[PDB]
Design a protein around this nucleic acid. Structure first.
Ligand SMILES: [Mg+2]
Ligand SMILES: [Zn+2]
Lengths: 143, 1111, 56, 221, 55, 110, 170, 14, 94
DNA sequence: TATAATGGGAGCTGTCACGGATGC
DNA sequence: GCATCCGTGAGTCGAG
């Protein structure tokens, strides 16, 4: 981009790259249920592991996994997203065998459902905010 | 006006008939004028012959003939008929050993006819069959990409006539042949052909080590019979190798001239490449009892001789225009003929068994439907068969010279990479480098060069002049791209005194690459620069001054120019503008020397020398495929003396026989208050005042009345519950009256339908009761004028069931057509362009008094922002503007040919002569330099534009020679601080007008399965808010807006209804519900055996079908 | 002299200091005057304006 | 005050190369094979070209065209991929509380000199602007606290420091290191570059990243 | 109730017959004369629903 | 019959069915109208007494969707059939008056 | 495909404020139709909605008070303009529309860059945000004048280019 | 594949 | 730009919260017919007609104008929804 | 409701680059 | 472990 005279903030590329690094490969299940060679989200294994080691169990050994934007995209937990993006039949068969449930975290899932998205004015953060004029305010303050 | 033409280059020959590629091709394909016994075996005659005789009874083909068209072209276009001629075939059924022959002329249906200008009429609408470029059949050798050492020999036949075959050396050293995706050792086939190890050993032995890689002991043992069956078993498993089957298959694969047809061009390529003689277009032959080889051994010899470097053996370019050929309309149509014919024959053979074996006439044996349908298919649903583009004469003339990579037996675009698209060095004088589509099709669609001809073999040839010694003959040799590579060819512009080469060093090409050469080494020379470019490109003056990328747009856009009621040829022309009006039949001309008898708006009657009185009807206000008006107008007067070839009438968009696409306007190149920002254009209201850029358009509306199961559809003036106001302009039968002005909402043709099964709501019953009126039997279905359309009713046509000469598709009672015309003035949003690629929409129409103007009070017509020039690098428009100025004042027009035209010195001289007129008059009229002209001159000499100390007149002239004038701002009266470029420019009004493109929708038609709004203005449907637009809303974090897009505004039914009712009642829109297309998704997934369930936060199911789909 | 870059920087700085509503106003102002002047300035292209250096 | 010269200098229109083609020579052209012709086009667009020169140029024109035509689809596809990867990522909270961070170098080792040279302005601005400070940083007597979103000025300051050898690299919060689940946190993301202020929680950061990376796509040659 | 999740899984012949409002026994679609949907064919009202509301 | 998936154009972008409207499901406009009509008929049936409004509602099937014989409405109200006929006729007549005066339901002429 | 979406040719609007666009009357009549019906009912322009719609159905039946009412209908409201390709979020922007005669949409010069719009025949699509919520989102979040800096770099997106530079530099 | 081929073969078994 | 947009963004922790507050308030104004407004007669947003100046019909314009005053209170969990809706229907019936 | 009749027929070729599995 | 097969992708909106 620099060579092409395009000003672009590292931030964004970082945002994507982080998603490239979202996954890890299992080296040892230790005392865990997981099995060697199996890929999963770094998040999930960090959590599980803390459960094990904090419960007095042997932790899982994991290895960082770099995978391109396409593969990462198809490997997302949400099946509505994955089946929307590519390889619909593959994604769907592998999903339906497993009986996956989509939690509707992502924009794509909700767009498909016609739901109000989890971003912007749909963010749970600002979503529930109320507005009331002083009059009505004190008015209800009596209780 | 006086016409001065620049340039000393002499055209030894004129341009070939421009539509000859179409006309001559089809002519040769039909051979209608040739007597059946004199016919060559080509085109239709070849097809018939290839199909016949039909063996087992033996049905044989004698001759065929074509009749006359049952209806004339105008009749066809009016009635929605194909223009065609009846095809008959004389066939004789022969019983062998039974002696008897029964002969009859059977009717094979109709074959579409090409019109005078090279087009077709198919179901009433004009069509063009675009020529198709492809890899010429033959035998080519291309280096293996995996191994540098090893090459691949490809054998390619005509498409749809046999499979390609690949020969490779192999890593091991054994030769491999690939056919139908199966590889086997070539030696096996070689054996089948009767080759013996000895026969091979003497033949291929010269090239060491390869032949031994050839030799296989077992195969040599077997002989043809053993080896043929071996091969047959290699080709297909699990099929008994009954020897007759093996012979039948290998024959059908190679030797069969019916199933495997090399090109005649392919044949020639093979012969020329491998230095051999083919007894036919087949790879091998069956003579007497055994297979005989023809192509294989020579191509193997060439392959080997190539692998081990042998002088005289070449790798093939495969984008060289010698190895790529054009399949013209004749070849394509004929191909489909051959197909439908082979099917018809299949049917014959099928009927030679069942039914009466003894009593068969040829009429009994033959069914046309396969043939009729093959031809109808080609002309009607083919890709190369296109709706004719006739926006203006040039549109169609170019449409016909179009060349396409795409189409059946053609590149798919995943196929198409850089190699095919590229401009090959051999496109010189054959295919235009400039004229190609912009965008995805770039390099695929292309246009034929002006002087180029497609020969018998389908190779594109270009003219050159022979040069022997130093002398340039007037004899022209048309060369194929391959032959061309042999000679050193001089550039056309190379200086000559007489026929002698006047330069010590001339610019020439040896195999496309430029080199400086002596007049001794010059073998040929270009005919003209025109030959290098397409017809459209040849209409761009100063082309040598325009960057190619923009020239491209110039060419392409002339095709889009709308014919104007007051049209003019450009003040600067290239000199092709007349011959174009000619070769495309738009203008009407006199056949022989004669005298004009009658002259009318409708017709012209001419009495020739012969004494015979010829009458020419004129096409008046006839609509075209694009809706532009085609009409001719008389250009002569009664009693006028006209010579053979003289102009009797003008086409659409021509002026006295010169092509007139736009108008010549006075233009100033300066920014103007940001109204010409970013390519936008500013226009003088004077333009509308004098009807410049006004164009006539006709739209066609159509409606049918049919037989319902519920009753007849009636076309009547009686429409339920309509006021006289609404029916006013409707005649007695219900059709709008000719001449009536119609606007959106107005009824064009009244029509009633029978109401269906009626479920009157209780509300309907109480209402009906309250008013005492009865619900009518018929609904109002009358055809109304669509939104944003309308005009004057110029025509009606009415066709009813059971009146003379008319038959309508089954069930259709009647059909009415209303032709509505409109006179379109130029307006904001409309699109203008020039021949140099400058294109822009009109952003502001200024009242004359705001228009920048010259000291003598003459206002400019158009204001073009100069910022458009530097980036685009299209300077032609600038020179055109200068010469346009000179012309403006001298009252004259010019012809400045491509690459040989007016150089700037000559333009400067003309400019001076013009200035004398500009300023001189003023001086005589008793006026001196204006106070303001002095200030502008001051700033000018500050800009280094004029020489200081010289007089005001002398300086103003100094600026005029630079094409600049003092310009007065009409608003202030003060001048423009600097001197400004003003001149005459040729500008066209393109086919893209806001009137057509403006559209909006609140609610409307939805779609069957998805319930989402329909698409397109004509369906009156919403705009596509796609994945990317959604992304855009997501990024803004505009949730509720997005949700509206996904629900209330599209396929949420409950939601959109509630929204509409709320907005009608002034209430806020309701919460959106579930989009119907998600339900569609769920069910489509259930149909796929997958169970999709929406869930609670508690994981309990949620029913989005609201109980409707659950027991 | 004011040009592409300078003006960009002006806009950015104004966005930081003054704020967006004002910056909008400034943008419309720059627009208006810029156009107004552009038209009277007498910028144009004649063929002579492509100046071939004697050095060529 | 020449119109070409002015339009170019101002940045209104035009660039040096185009001006060259108009005024000086047109230059060397390339065959379709990619290798350039031995003879350059000597003509300028003012002078006008020779049919041979013109035709020679057409090769490049076309190659360029087809290039653009294909790159367009390549870029489009890319963008859609990116959007598909980043879409769930949103600012979901103000602080993931992580102690981690990334360290933006102001110096890039030069391999030609086998030495160290300061990174280019825009490069550094792209690395630092609108980022929250991961650690406290004191240069040229100015304290930059933790949690401080770096202004463009802040960044320029830091550069000037790096020129005084005060600081070699800057600790900065970043999406790479952010520990928010299913997205990112205000502090780790930094400025909403569009408003030159802290990003508002709820901003769809992923989609913005994809659009940002992909939009120039068709411009990369 | 509000939808918070979407599960997708294989269907058993039992479940498929659960969804089913009838078996399609005939390849027929619409009657040739009347044009009314054929009984026990792809378009039946006895299986899929009435062509007209509440009728 | 013809395929809804018949391709339109040499590009694989559009299908024939894409241009076939849905003539079954009521338009938002139609729906709107059909509800406005109910609200206006109700607004007009308030000017009537509950009995003379209920006679019309009952006999024209505005309720339950069935039309009752004058005899059944008489049985429901306790009046003689001819009585219910005359209070239905006077009801309807008052309705007509209100209409010629107010000009409301007129636009539903269609 | 969405409801209340139109399209037309774009044409430069030097005279409009950064937060405005030129929106052809007819387009506005269609896009806001329902609103215009209700308003037509508030003012006595038609007995009711069902009548109003018929009045708008025939083009010749359209009085001027209709237009005046339409001006009242769109007050304060913004519409979305979109050009394709929509590469970044600035491919859609919100403008308070100014009804104009004529058939083409007027676009502000400063936003052309973000749209990669120009006037060699570019066409844009209009969308009406319906709810108070949608309108709020549009006016606050998507309004052209509220997005002046690129989200990619934070450098100004709305800035002088071309004609403006040519004059100012001069 | 090619069910026709397979079936033809199965037929040729009797 | 919208008037005082910078101040409005100033008022909130997230621009989207501003948007929500404005939208909801506008819904309130529409629902109760503007008679619940916190604006005084001289602050009432106005609109030009052929007749003259009438109340601006646009509830969002109103909402933002009101927000500028500071007469309005916003946040989360201020009052149960029942109490709000009903107290408002008592104070300003529809 | 009966002479005997017994293994098909067309095909379509000028992309390109990847992940992933399969075989040597 | 590397060769090679199959399968899946390859811009948007518009008109038509
Ligand atoms: Mg454009
Ligand atoms: Zn964080």
């Amino acid at each position: 981009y620099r060579a092409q005279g395009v000003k672009l903030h590292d931030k964004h590329i970082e945002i994507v790259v982080r998603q490239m690094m979202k996954y890890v490969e299992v080296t040892d299940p230790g005392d865990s249920r997981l099995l060697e060679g199996q890929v999963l989200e770094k998040w999930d294994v960090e959590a599980l592991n803390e459960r094990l080691i904090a419960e007095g169990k042997t932790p899982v050994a994991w290895k960082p996994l770099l995978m391109g934007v396409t593969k990462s995209a198809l490997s997302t937990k949400s099946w509505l997203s994955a089946a929307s993006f590519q390889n619909t039949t593959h994604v769907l068969t592998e999903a339906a065998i497993a009986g996956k449930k989509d939690e509707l975290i992502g924009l794509k899932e909700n767009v498909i459902l016609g739901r109000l998205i989890p971003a912007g004015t749909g963010s749970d953060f600002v979503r529930f905010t109320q507005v009331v004029d002083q009059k009505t305010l004190k008015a209800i303050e009596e209780a | 006006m006086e016409i001065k033409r620049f340039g000393r280059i002499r055209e030894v020959i004129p341009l070939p008939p421009l539509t000859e590629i179409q006309v001559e091709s089809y002519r040769r394909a039909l051979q209608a004028d040739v007597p059946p016994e004199k016919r060559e075996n080509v085109g239709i005659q070849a097809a018939f012959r290839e199909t016949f005789p039909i063996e087992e009874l033996v049905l044989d083909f004698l001759e065929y003939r074509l009749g006359e068209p049952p209806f004339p072209q105008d009749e066809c276009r009016e009635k929605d008929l194909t223009y065609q001629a009846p095809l008959y075939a004389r066939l004789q059924l022969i019983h062998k050993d039974t002696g008897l022959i029964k002969e009859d002329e059977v009717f094979l249906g109709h074959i579409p006819l090409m019109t005078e200008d090279g087009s077709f009429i198919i179901n009433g609408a004009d069509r063009v069959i675009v020529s198709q470029i492809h890899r010429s059949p033959g035998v080519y050798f291309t280096p293996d990409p995996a191994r540098p050492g090893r090459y691949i020999a490809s054998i390619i036949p005509l498409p749809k006539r046999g499979p390609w075959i690949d020969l490779e050396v192999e890593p091991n050293g054994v030769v491999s042949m690939k056919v139908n995706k199966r590889k086997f050792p070539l030696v096996l086939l070689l054996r089948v052909l009767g080759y013996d190890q000895e026969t091979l050993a003497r033949e291929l032995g010269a090239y060491g080590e390869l032949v031994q890689g050839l030799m296989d002991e077992s195969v040599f043992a077997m002989r043809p019979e053993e080896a043929l069956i071996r091969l047959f078993t290699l080709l297909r498993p699990g099929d008994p190798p009954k020897r007759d089957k093996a012979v039948a298959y290998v024959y059908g694969l190679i030797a069969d001239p019916r199933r495997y047809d090399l090109g005649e061009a392919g044949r020639y390529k093979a012969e020329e490449k491998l230095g051999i003689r083919l007894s036919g277009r087949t790879l091998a032959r069956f003579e007497d009892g055994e297979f005989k080889d023809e192509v294989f051994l020579p191509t193997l010899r060439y392959l080997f001789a190539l692998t081990a470097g042998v002088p005289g053996h070449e790798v093939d370019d495969i984008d060289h225009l010698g190895n790529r050929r054009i399949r013209t309309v004749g070849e394509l149509m004929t191909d489909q003929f051959r197909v439908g014919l082979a099917r018809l024959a299949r049917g014959v053979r099928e009927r030679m068994l069942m039914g009466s074996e003894d009593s068969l006439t040829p009429a009994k044996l033959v069914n046309s439907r396969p043939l009729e349908a093959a031809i109808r298919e080609f002309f009607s649903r083919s890709q190369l068969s296109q709706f004719k583009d006739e926006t203006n004469p040039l549109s169609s003339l170019r449409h016909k010279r179009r060349i396409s990579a795409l189409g059946p037996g053609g590149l798919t675009r995943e196929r198409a990479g850089f190699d095919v698209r590229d401009v090959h060095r051999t496109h010189y004088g054959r295919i235009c480098p400039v004229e190609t589509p912009e965008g995805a099709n770039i390099g695929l669609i292309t246009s034929l060069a002006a002087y180029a001809r497609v020969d018998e073999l389908g190779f594109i040839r270009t003219p050159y002049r022979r040069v022997v010694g130093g002398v340039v003959t007037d004899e022209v040799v048309y060369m194929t791209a391959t032959e061309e590579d042999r000679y050193t060819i001089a550039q056309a512009n190379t200086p000559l005194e007489g026929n002698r080469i006047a330069a010590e060093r001339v610019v020439a090409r040896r195999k496309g690459e430029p080199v400086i050469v002596s007049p001794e080494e010059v073998e040929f020379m270009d005919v003209s620069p025109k030959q290098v470019f397409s017809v459209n490109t040849n209409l761009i003056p100063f082309l040598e001054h325009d960057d190619a990328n923009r020239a491209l747009m110039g060419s392409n856009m002339q095709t889009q120019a709308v014919p104007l009621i007051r049209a003019q040829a450009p003040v600067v022309m290239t000199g092709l503008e007349e011959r174009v009006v000619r070769d495309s039949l738009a203008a009407l001309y006199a056949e022989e020397d004669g005298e004009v008898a009658k002259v009318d708006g409708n017709r012209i009657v001419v009495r020739y020398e012969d004494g015979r009185l010829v009458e020419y009807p004129l096409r008046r206000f006839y609509r075209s495929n694009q809706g532009t008006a085609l009409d001719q107008r008389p250009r002569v007067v009664v009693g006028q003396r006209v010579r053979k070839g003289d102009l009797l009438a003008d086409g659409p968009a021509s002026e006295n026989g010169f092509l007139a696409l736009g108008q010549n306007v006075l233009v100033a190149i300066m920014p103007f208050d940001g109204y010409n920002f970013e390519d936008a254009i500013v226009i003088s209201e004077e333009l509308l005042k004098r009807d410049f850029y006004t164009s006539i358009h006709i739209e066609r509306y159509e409606i049918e009345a049919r037989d319902t199961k519920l009753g007849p559809e009636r076309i009547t003036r009686d429409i339920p519950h309509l006021s006289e106001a609404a029916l006013r302009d409707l005649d007695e039968e219900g059709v709008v009256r000719i001449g009536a002005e119609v606007k959106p909402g107005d009824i064009l043709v009244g029509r009633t339908s029978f109401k269906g099964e009626s479920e009157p709501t209780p509300e309907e019953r109480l209402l009906r009761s309250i008013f005492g009126e009865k619900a009518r039997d018929v609904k109002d279905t009358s055809l109304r004028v669509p939104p944003g359309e309308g005009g004057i009713v110029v025509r009606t046509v009415r066709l009813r069931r059971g009146d003379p000469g008319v038959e309508l598709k089954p069930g259709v009672r009647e059909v009415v057509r209303v032709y509505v015309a409109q006179k379109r003035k130029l307006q904001v949003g409309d699109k203008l362009a020039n021949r140099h690629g400058n294109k822009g929409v009109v952003a502001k129409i200024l009242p004359v008094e705001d228009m920048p103007h010259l000291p003598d009070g003459t206002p400019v017509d158009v204001i073009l922002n100069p910022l458009g020039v530097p980036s685009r690098m299209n300077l032609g428009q600038i020179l055109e503007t200068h010469l346009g100025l000179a012309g403006y004042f001298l009252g004259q027009r010019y012809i400045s040919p491509i690459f040989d035209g007016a150089k700037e010195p000559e333009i400067k001289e003309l400019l001076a002569q013009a200035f004398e007129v500009y300023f001189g008059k003023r001086k005589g009229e008793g006026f001196g330099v204006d106070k303001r002209e002095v200030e502008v001159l001051r700033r000018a000499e500050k800009l280094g534009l004029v020489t200081p100390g010289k007089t005001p007149e002398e300086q103003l002239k100094e600026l005029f020679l630079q094409g600049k004038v003092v310009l007065y701002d009409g608003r202030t009266g003060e001048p423009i601080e600097g001197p400004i470029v003003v001149g005459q420019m040729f500008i066209m009004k393109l086919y893209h007008m806001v009137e057509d493109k403006m559209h909006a929708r609140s609610t409307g038609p939805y779609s069957l399965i998805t319930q989402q709004p329909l698409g397109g203005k004509a369906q009156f449907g919403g705009q596509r808010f796609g994945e990317m637009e959604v992304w855009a809303l997501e990024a803004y974090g505009a949730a509720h807006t997005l949700q509206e897009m996904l629900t209330l505004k599209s396929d949420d039914i409950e939601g959109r209804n509630a929204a509409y009712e709320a907005i009608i009642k002034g209430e806020d829109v309701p919460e959106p519900s579930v989009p119907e297309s998600f339900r569609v998704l769920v069910k489509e997934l259930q149909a796929l055996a997958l169970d999709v369930q929406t869930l609670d936060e508690k994981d309990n199911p949620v029913d989005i079908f609201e109980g409707l789909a659950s027991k | 002299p004011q040009e592409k870059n300078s003006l960009k920087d002006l806009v950015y700085q104004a966005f930081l200091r003054l704020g967006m509503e004002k910056t909008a106003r400034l943008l419309d102002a720059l627009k208006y005057y810029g156009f107004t002047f552009s038209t009277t300035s007498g910028i144009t292209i004649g063929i002579d304006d492509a100046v071939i250096p004697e050095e060529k | 005050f020449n119109p070409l010269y002015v339009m170019a200098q101002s940045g209104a229109r035009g660039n040096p190369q185009q001006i060259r083609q108009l005024c000086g020579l047109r230059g060397l052209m390339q065959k379709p094979s990619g290798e350039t012709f031995e003879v350059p086009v000597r003509s300028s667009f003012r002078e006008g070209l020779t049919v041979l020169e013109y035709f020679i140029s057409s090769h490049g024109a076309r190659k360029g065209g087809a290039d653009t035509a294909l790159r367009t689809a390549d870029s489009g596809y890319l963008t859609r991929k990116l959007v598909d990867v980043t879409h769930e990522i949103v600012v979901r909270e103000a602080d993931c509380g992580t102690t981690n961070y990334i360290s933006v170098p102001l110096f890039q080792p030069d391999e030609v000199t086998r030495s160290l040279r300061l990174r280019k302005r825009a490069d550094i601005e792209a690395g630092l602007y609108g980022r929250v400070l991961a650690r406290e940083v004191e240069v040229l007597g100015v304290r930059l606290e933790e949690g401080r979103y770096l202004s463009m000025d802040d960044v320029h300051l830091l550069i000037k420091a790096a020129e005084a050898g005060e600081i070699q690299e800057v600790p900065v919060r970043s999406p790479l290191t952010c520990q928010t689940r299913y997205g990112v946190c205000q502090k780790c993301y930094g400025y909403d570059l569009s408003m030159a202020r802290p990003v508002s929680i709820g901003e769809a950061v992923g989609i913005v990243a994809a659009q940002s990376i992909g939009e120039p796509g068709t411009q990369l040659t | 109730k509000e939808v918070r999740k979407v599960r997708i899984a294989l269907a058993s012949p039992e479940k498929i017959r659960s969804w089913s409002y009838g078996e399609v026994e005939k390849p027929e679609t619409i009657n040739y004369r009347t044009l009314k949907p054929e009984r026990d064919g792809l378009f039946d009202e006895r299986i899929f629903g009435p062509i007209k509301d509440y009728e | 019959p013809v395929s809804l998936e018949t391709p339109i154009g040499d590009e694989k972008d559009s299908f024939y069915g894409d241009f076939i409207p849905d003539e079954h499901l009521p338009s938002p406009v139609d729906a709107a109208t059909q509800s406005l009509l109910s609200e206006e008929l109700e607004k007009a049936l308030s000017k009537l007494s509950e009995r003379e409004a209920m006679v019309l509602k009952l006999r024209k099937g505005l309720i339950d969707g069935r039309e009752h014989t004058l005899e059944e409405v008489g049985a429901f109200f306790g009046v003689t059939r001819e009585r219910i006929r005359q209070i239905e006729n006077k009801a309807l007549r008052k309705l007509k008056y209100h209409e010629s005066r107010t000009r409301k339901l007129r636009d539903f002429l269609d | 495909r969405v409801d209340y979406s139109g399209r037309s040719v774009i044409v430069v609007g030097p005279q409009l404020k950064l937060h405005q666009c030129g929106l052809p009357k007819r387009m506005a009549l269609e896009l806001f139709k329902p609103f215009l019906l209700k308003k037509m009912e508030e003012k006595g322009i038609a007995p009711n909605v069902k009548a109003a719609r018929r009045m708008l159905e025939r083009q010749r039946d359209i009085k001027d008070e209709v237009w005046d009412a339409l001006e009242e209908v769109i007050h304060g409201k913004v519409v979305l303009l979109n050009r394709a390709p929509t590469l970044h979020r600035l491919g859609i922007q919100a403008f308070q529309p100014v009804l104009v005669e004529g058939q083409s949409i007027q676009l502000h010069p400063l936003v052309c860059e973000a749209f990669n719009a120009d006037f060699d025949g570019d066409q844009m699509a209009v969308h009406v945000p319906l709810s108070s919520f949608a309108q709020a989102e549009a006016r606050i979040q998507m309004l052209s004048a509220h997005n002046l800096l690129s989200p990619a770099s934070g450098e100004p997106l709305a800035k002088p280019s071309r004609d403006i530079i040519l004059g100012l530099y001069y | 594949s090619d069910p026709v081929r397979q079936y033809l073969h199965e037929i040729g078994q009797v | 730009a919208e008037p005082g947009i910078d101040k409005l963004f100033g008022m909130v922790d997230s621009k989207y919260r501003l948007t929500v507050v404005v939208a909801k308030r506008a819904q309130q104004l529409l629902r109760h017919g503007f008679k619940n407004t916190v604006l005084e007669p001289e602050e009432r947003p106005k609109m030009q007609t052929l007749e003259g100046l009438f109340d601006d019909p646009n509830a969002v314009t109103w909402a933002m104008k009101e927000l500028l005053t500071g007469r309005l209170v916003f946040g989360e969990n201020l009052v149960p929804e029942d109490r709000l809706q009903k107290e408002m229907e008592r104070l300003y019936p529809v």
